[PDB]
């Protein structure tokens, strides 16, 4: 099993860990901030997914410094993760294209 597939697998596991830790820590950052909506675990988890995929729905977002710090890590993990799957598919196609010219 090639590096690029191990890495994509790793990045998926690591992103799901980031989405759960992020759920938990967003609620922990945002409770105590009057007006905050990112304060129960289930919608925190939905929030973490729409943040990682950079969907920017705009139904939920953090209003505190530590919530926003948590948000930044989730976004970076999401963009890296999905970038790494792209790199992995590039490698696969470059390989399949070497072979298809008998290199």
């Amino acid at each position, epitope marked *: 099993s090639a590096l690029h597939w191990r890495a994509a697998g790793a990045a998926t596991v690591l992103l799901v860990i980031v989405l759960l830790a992020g759920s*938990y820590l967003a609620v*922990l950052a*945002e*409770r*105590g901030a*009057p*007006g905050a909506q990112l*304060i*129960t*675990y289930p919608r925190a988890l939905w929030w973490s997914v729409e943040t990682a995929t950079t969907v920017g729905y705009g139904d939920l977002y953090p209003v505190t410094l530590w919530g926003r710090c948590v948000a930044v890590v989730v976004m970076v993990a999401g963009i890296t993760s999905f970038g790494l799957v792209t790199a992995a598919l590039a490698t696969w196609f470059v390989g399949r294209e070497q072979e298809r010219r008998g290199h």
Partner: antibody
Amino acid sequence: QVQLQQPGAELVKPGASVKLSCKASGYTFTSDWIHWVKQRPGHGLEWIGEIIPSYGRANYNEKIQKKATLTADKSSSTAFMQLSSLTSEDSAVYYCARERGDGYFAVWGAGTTVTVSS
Amino acid sequence: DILLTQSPAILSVSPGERVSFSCRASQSIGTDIHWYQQRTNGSPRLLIKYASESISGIPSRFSGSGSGTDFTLSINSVESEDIANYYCQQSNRWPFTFGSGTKLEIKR
């Protein structure tokens, strides 16, 4: 089972403080928040504050004079509320309740009647 | 902070009749409203969560409806054991807040 056990009563001299206890049983999660709610006789429910025992962070009602300090003992599954410098304004039933981090008080203690009097 | 208005404060009904308790939020809170029953000398008891969801242990007689700002807890065919104060509570925005309460009173 009784999920939340509170002492029936505390008498407190005016000016003095008191620690209320709240010993939890049944399922405990990392996610669990313990809340405290004040009810004066013939009056409604007043949210005082919350603590997350797994991390020990606490938040308080801004809109009222801060009387309370919340702590928890991870090992003995007990949450504490230190009410300090009481007056007759502070005479009330104090409920503890458990929230699974999903927004609603699944279960309440039976409440501690706190009387401030000489 | 979200204000929950429960008007009227007292609701009189005859035995076996249907009754509706109102809860109005000062801004939209979707379906993040939960309802408690508190009998005389008793602690609160969760009846309905997220505006409409059953709790096991609660008579089918109880139901909830509403979204946004206007929420209703209903009892089809009231009976004596329903005599209590009924409170609403929001979890949309920090901090959680309670309605001022509505007493049910039966005219027998």
